[PDB]
Structures are given as structure tokens and as C-alpha cells.
Amino acid sequence: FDRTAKPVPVITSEVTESLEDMIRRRIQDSNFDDLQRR
Amino acid sequence: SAEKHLSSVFKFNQHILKNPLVAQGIVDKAQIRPSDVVLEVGPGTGNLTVRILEQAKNVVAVEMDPRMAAELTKRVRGTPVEKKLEIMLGDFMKTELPYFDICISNTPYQISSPLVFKLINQPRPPRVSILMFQREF
Amino acid sequence: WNIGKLIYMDNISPEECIRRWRVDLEKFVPYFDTFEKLAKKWKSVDAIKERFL
């Protein structure tokens, strides 16, 4: 049978590793999406 | 200072093609081997100098306008092909060229016809050279 | 000794067959003579000039 809604994700280690790599890569370049004074 | 000397030698005061397909054809005709080395001239943005970096062991590029060369450096800084790439300032006619197995470059049309005979004269010339010229010439 | 007959006479072994009118395919590379013998046999490239252009 099919399912109506998107299943809730699980934070497995591979997803954690992939997420952490992106976080590390962003800070290597200092590419930060943060608010600044106008 | 180093900066004052650089300003004196060049004041730091060319239109380029954007269609990639012809550039791919230019690369295909050269058929550069990994063992073989290439001399680059007037590299410009470095969209062409990266292609030769992809298919050649080593690349040394000579640019007319020093600013146009400098940004080419910034493009390659911190890249695997950074070691291979080299840059030069001042016209190729003027200084002895490093020995190269093929000539691929964006030759200026003013020096294009002079360029070819230098290749013919220069000992150990490239076995094949691919260049862009004016249709009439 | 027509070979065409000898091949289908299962009683005669192939090694017996080959000699009269004159090991395992799992080895793809076929049998060859010793290297030094082959090298001498061809110090010239004659006997094949017909095959090549």
C-alpha cells in the first residue's frame, strides 16, 4: 500500500557525516549566511 | 618598493570568444598527450588555460595585460593544477620561450602571422600547433 | 588420412589424430614456442610480406 505523507527522516550517521562535512566546508571558506549591520 | 617597480615596467592599462564548442574542437585538434607539454600565450580569462591544464603535464601562460594575467592566477590558486600552471609577463616574441611540445594559445591577430614564423624558426618546434586566425589572412 | 574423418572418430585421441595426418581451452592464450627460438625464426620479417600491405 502507498502512504499519504512524506515519512519522517532518521538522523543516521551517514546523514550526520554529510551534514557535518557541509558545516566544515562552509567554515573553511567562511561562507556564512548571517545578518549584518546596515 | 616591488609595487613601484611593477608599475614602471607595465602601466596595467582584449575581446574573447565565449562559445565553448569551438574551444573543444581546438583542444581535439591538438590531441595533446599527458607526457607532452604546451606553451600558452595570451591566455586571458583562463577558461582556455584550464583546458590545457586538464590535458597536459605543464602549462606556462604569457599575457599581454598584467591585470588579465593576475586574475588568471587567482582562478588557479589553491587548485590541483596550480603547481603545473605558470604565468609570464611581456610579449612572447621578446624572451626565449620554454620548450613546448604543442602550441595552443589565443594569439593576437596583430602578432599572429609573426607568431607562426617564430614557431617555424624556433628549434625543436611543436609537432602540431592549433591557432585562431583572421579568415582572410 | 583425411582429417575431416579423424576429428569425428572419437576413438582416436586428438594427440593421436594430429600426428597421423601430419590441451584445454580454459587457457585462453594459445600455445607458443620458446622466446629465443621465436626471436631467431624472425630475425627477418620474410614469409609474411604477403599478409601485410
Binding site: 532518521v10 538522523i11 543516521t12 550517521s13 550526520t16 | - | -
Partner: protein, 73 residues
Amino acid sequence: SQLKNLKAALKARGLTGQTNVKSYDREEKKKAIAEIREEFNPFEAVGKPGISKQIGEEQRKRAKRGGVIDKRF
């Protein structure tokens, strides 16, 4: 708190600071990077039991006519 410990752990293994200091092999450094990364993740300081589900999905991830029947002893 945690940042102080992480700074100390990197400094103890020499992962931070000046390299040209005047007056550790690289392979061991990568081992330290692996150790500090796994040590400083409490979710995967240690978290309470049951907060992660990893061994669950992995078991699930592990979970044609005719075939060879091999009677060889």
C-alpha cells in the same frame, strides 16, 4: 565549556597553533582527527540511552527461480 576541551584536545595533539615555531607525523594527525570527531559527538559528554536509532535502521537496511544446491561437505 565544550569549546575549551576541544581547544585543549587539538592543542595536545598539535592540531592548532604555529608550525614554524623555532626554539608528530602527519599520519598520526589524521588518527587524532578521527578520535576527536567521535569523542566530541555525544548524540551518536555522553548521551542518555535510546536517544539514537542508528542500530535500528542498519538492521533494517541489512534485511528468481532455481539455484545451486551445494551438497558438498
